[PDB]
Structure formats: C-alpha cells, structure tokens
C-alpha cells in the first residue's frame, strides 16, 4: 500500500483538529501559524499512527491569471461496517465484503467508548471512517448511517 | 460571465462563515444542520450580492469502493491589487493589468475600514479577494502580501 489517497483542501478551509498530510503522513493539526520568512501558513500536527509531531507549510501556485491558490492535502477516508468489537480492535468489513479482523481504533476523543455505545444499539447502522496509509489502516472516527 | 468558477470542498471542512455556492449563488453559511429525511447536511446561507437566504443540501456520491464523499462547491477567489479607494468602491487591477474602476466592496466584518487602514500604510501590498459571478464582481475579503 502506497501513501494514503488524498483530496485538495483550500487553506481557508483548514481549522484546528483537521487531518492533513504533513511530511507525507496523516496528522491532526494542533497549530496553524504564519511563517515570518515566507508569509505562508505553517501547520503543526500529530501523526495519527506514531503520535510524533510534524510540520509542513503550504505554498502558492498560480493556475490562472489573478488566481492564487494555497492548499494542503487531506486523506480520503473510507467507510467500513462494524461487525464486532473485541478488546481495543474491531472486526470491520469494506463495502465489497472484505473482512478486516483486527482493525485498530485510534484513541482520540473517546472514539472507542462512543463506538461501542453505538454498536450495542444498532450494529448494522454503525460505520467507522478509516485512514489507510502505507499498508496501515485505522478507524479515526465513526458515523451511524443517516436517517 | 457565467457562474463563478469553483473548487470542491469536503463537507467535514465546512464551518459557519464559509462561502459556498448555494442554489447557484455565493453565500455565507450561517447554519449547518442535518436533514431528518435524508440524513444529509443542509446549509443555510446569505447571498453575498442580494443578501437573500438560500438553502441547499449536500448529496452522497461513491467514487471508489468504500469511499463515500459528501461535498459542496466553494467559489474560486481572485486576487486584485488596490490602486485607489473612493466612496464605497475601489480602483482595482488584476494580475495582468486590467483596471476595474469601481469594484464594490462587501459590507461585512468592517472590511472597508480594515481595507482603508491597510491601504493608507502600504497601498502596493494590499490585495482584495474577489468573487466573480454572472458578470458581477465584489471584494469580499482582503490580504496584505505576506512577508
């Protein structure tokens, strides 16, 4: 598995807590500042897998006349179904039926407790948002299927 | 001039105050809610030009297996230079030298006062972010060129 698939995010649509690809890896943004040297936005984030800190700045590109764009990359999250939960990990299933027996769940904002609560009251309607990067996969958020 | 040029914005990167295209026009989002009928995000916004209220929901598309995307469109802002300011409007110039003698400035968050203040202390470094839609143009934000 190569680096996570991504989408382009306008810098003016980036806030604290958002997940961006910083130095090649998915990180939770904890600080947005301005570089004194370039005037560009600098992002400080926490690697979702290693929990290490990384920094990367945006840069300016000029697609068309008078159009200045400043963007960062965000990961494409996949949505898997939750079939079972067992000690820290879950049994997930992709849209096509591919079974992941031990999908890890990130320890952030009580995701596990919220996930387990939703599972015990509508298992089939519970979904996990998953980040896939260099072979690794991990549920980073949840979502009960809309009404 | 056709409808404003746009970029795709992930719904999880949309917050109050952001400008989105709602019912075909640039609007400032003032409320984000969930539709009881579809479970999709519903956006209530104020048309930047007419100040009228509009609503539009996101919808789900499935690009790849297990990939569920929910997005809205945002306008592509152009950056013009400020050559002069005169009673409510400004003389702007595009990146290519095209002169707009009476570019209107939106009355939002004291943009005019902030703009005039910056102009009187670094005219050449002052830039205005401009929304272009169906022939109309208007400065909706400002930006002094980075360091």
UniProtKB/Swiss-Prot annotation, chains A, B:
* Gene Ontology cellular-component annotations: cell septum; Woronin body
Q: List the disulfide bonds.
A: none
Q: Where are the transmembrane segments?
A: none
Q: Where in the cell is it found?
A: Cell septum
Mutant lacking the gene: phenotype: Impairs plugging of septal pores and leads to the loss of cytoplasm in hyphae severed by lightly drawing a scalpel blade.
Q: Which domain of life is it from?
A: Eukaryota
> A Gene Ontology molecular-function term?
translation elongation factor activity
Output the GO biological process annotations, alphabetical, semicolon-separated.
positive regulation of translational elongation; positive regulation of translational termination; translational elongation
Chief location: other
Subunit info here reads:
Forms oligomers. Self-assembles into hexagonal rods.
Task: Quote the function comment for this protein.
Answer: Major component of Woronin bodies, fungal-specific organelles that occlude septal pores in order to separate intact from damaged compartments. Hex-1 binds directly or indirectly to the Woronin body tether that in turn is anchored at the rim of the septal pore.
**Its family?**
Belongs to the eIF-5A family. Hex1 subfamily.
Q: What is this protein called?
A: Woronin body major protein
Q: Which organism is it from?
A: Neurospora crassa (strain ATCC 24698 / 74-OR23-1A / CBS 708.71 / DSM 1257 / FGSC 987)
Q: Name the encoding gene, please.
A: hex-1
Q: Which residues of the full protein are shown?
A: 27 to 173 of 176
